[PDB]
Amino acid sequence: EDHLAKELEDLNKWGLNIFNVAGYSHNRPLTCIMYAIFQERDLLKTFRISSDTFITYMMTLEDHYHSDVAYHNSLHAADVAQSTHVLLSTPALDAVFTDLEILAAIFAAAIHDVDHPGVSNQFLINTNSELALMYNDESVLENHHLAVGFKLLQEEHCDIFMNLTKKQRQTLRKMVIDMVLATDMSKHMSLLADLKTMVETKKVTSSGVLLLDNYTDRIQVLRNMVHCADLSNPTKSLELYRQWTDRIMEEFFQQGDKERERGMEISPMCDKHTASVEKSQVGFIDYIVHPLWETWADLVQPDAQDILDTLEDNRNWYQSMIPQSPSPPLDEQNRDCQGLMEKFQFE
Numbered sequence: 209e210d211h212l213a214k215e216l217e218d219l220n221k222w223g224l225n226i227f228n229v230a231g232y233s234h235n236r237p238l239t240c241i242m243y244a245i246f247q248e249r250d251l252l253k254t255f256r257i258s259s260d261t262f263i264t265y266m267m268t269l270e271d272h273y274h275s276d277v278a279y280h281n282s283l284h285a286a287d288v289a290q291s292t293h294v295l296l297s298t299p300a301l302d303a304v305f306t307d308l309e310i311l312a313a314i315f316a317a318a319i320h321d322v323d324h325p326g327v328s329n330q331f332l333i334n335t336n337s338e339l340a341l342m343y344n345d346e347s348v349l350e351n352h353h354l355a356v357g358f359k360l361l362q363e364e365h366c367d368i369f370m371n372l373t374k375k376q377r378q379t380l381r382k383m384v385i386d387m388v389l390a391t392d393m394s395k396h397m398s399l400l401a402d403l404k405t406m407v408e409t410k411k412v413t414s415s416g417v418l419l420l421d422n423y424t425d426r427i428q429v430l431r432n433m434v435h436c437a438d439l440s441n442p443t444k445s446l447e448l449y450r451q452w453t454d455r456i457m458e459e460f461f462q463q464g465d466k467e468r469e470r471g472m473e474i475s476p477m478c479d480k481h482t483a484s485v486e487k488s489q490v491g492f493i494d495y496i497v498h499p500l501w502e503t504w505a506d507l508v509q510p511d512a513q514d515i516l517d518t519l520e521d522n523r524n525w526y527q528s529m530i531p532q533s534p535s536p537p538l539d540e541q542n543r544d545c546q547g548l549m550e551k552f553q554f555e
């Protein structure tokens with residue numbers, strides 16, 4: 209009511225506590241944060257989007273997130289939108305992106321996990337589900353997210369791109385598809401390697417601002433930005449990071465319950481008690497999260513240094529929390545089950 213207003217003061221900040229805004233948004237945080245973001249950037253008045261169309265689309269979209277799914281619910285999407293919005297404001301990117309590219313980035317973030325069933329691509333592939341058979345086992349969920357994101361523009365009072373030029377809409381579409389498909393975890397290595405290649409040949413003005421003359425460079429940054437935002441959990445204050453960890457473990461273990469229930473024998477998951485939560489977060493940072501953010505900190509040198517420090521501290525905290533009292537860890541002592549990182553990896 210009025211507590212929402214105070215929390216939305218941290219809008220342009222990394223330290224925004226999205227869990228608090230969830231409680232004061234009447235369990236509707238994505239529409240809430242998206243309305244906030246779009247006003248702070250004057251996007252509604254720029255692209256001729258009325259309150260009616262926007263709210264209606266966001267309400268429709270947010271409702272297509274699963275509220276019973278532990279991690280991949282609308283709050284995660286709210287979190288990714290807000291984080292993306294911060295990253296767009298990064299000094300090294302000031303005046304670089306056009307309004308259509310800004311619109312594309314935040315919108316992509318909003319839809320990037322819509323209609324997520326709380327199971328991995330591989331689970332859908334192993335079960336011979338409709339979605340796997342439609343998308344040819346190829347970025348199954350990420351394709352679906354985009355499909356749903358754009359189909360919902362067709363519902364009543366939902367076309368927020370109504371008043372865009374045929375050209376602008378085509379360009380927006382191309383960018384959005386590109387950014388969201390980039391969120392495929394099996395494409396992480398491929399994407400990081402090219403980002404490194406882009407840093408190795410970076411061009412800047414004397415003030416520090418990056419120079420990205422043509423679309424190919426501009427789109428590559430946005431890909432990695434939304435991808436960083438998606439993988440930003442470990443870079444947040446440990447007050448939030450631990451909540452996200454709790455949530456992802458609940459969803460992942462719930463997938464493990466499904467697999468047993470259905471008697472799947474393709475690479476079985478180790479059940480909740482035998483898993484090593486803390487070492488997994490460490491491996492997660494070491495092999496995936498830190499390499500990507502380190503490369504990002506290079507690109508926006510040195511705007512993301514504070515973010516990078518926070519990450520390193522969080523890594524050392526989870527490392528210190530690894531109990532040596534069962535050695536080796538239980539998941540390594542079972543030749544049948546697979547540990548958290550083992551099952552997730554192999555990308």
Ligand SMILES: COc1ccc(C2CNC(=O)NC2)cc1O[C@H]1C[C@@H]2CC[C@H]1C2
Nearest residue numbers: 393441452453456488489492548549552
């Ligand atoms: C807070 O940690 C996570 C936050 C978000 C994710 C997402 C990333 N993208 C996905 O599409 N799915 C999982 C994973 C996280 O960690 C888990 C992965 C490793 C195995 C257990 C830990 C470590």
Ligand SMILES: [Mg+2]
Nearest residue numbers: 320321391392
């Ligand atoms: Mg995802």
Ligand SMILES: [Zn+2]
Nearest residue numbers: 320321391438
């Ligand atoms: Zn996501």
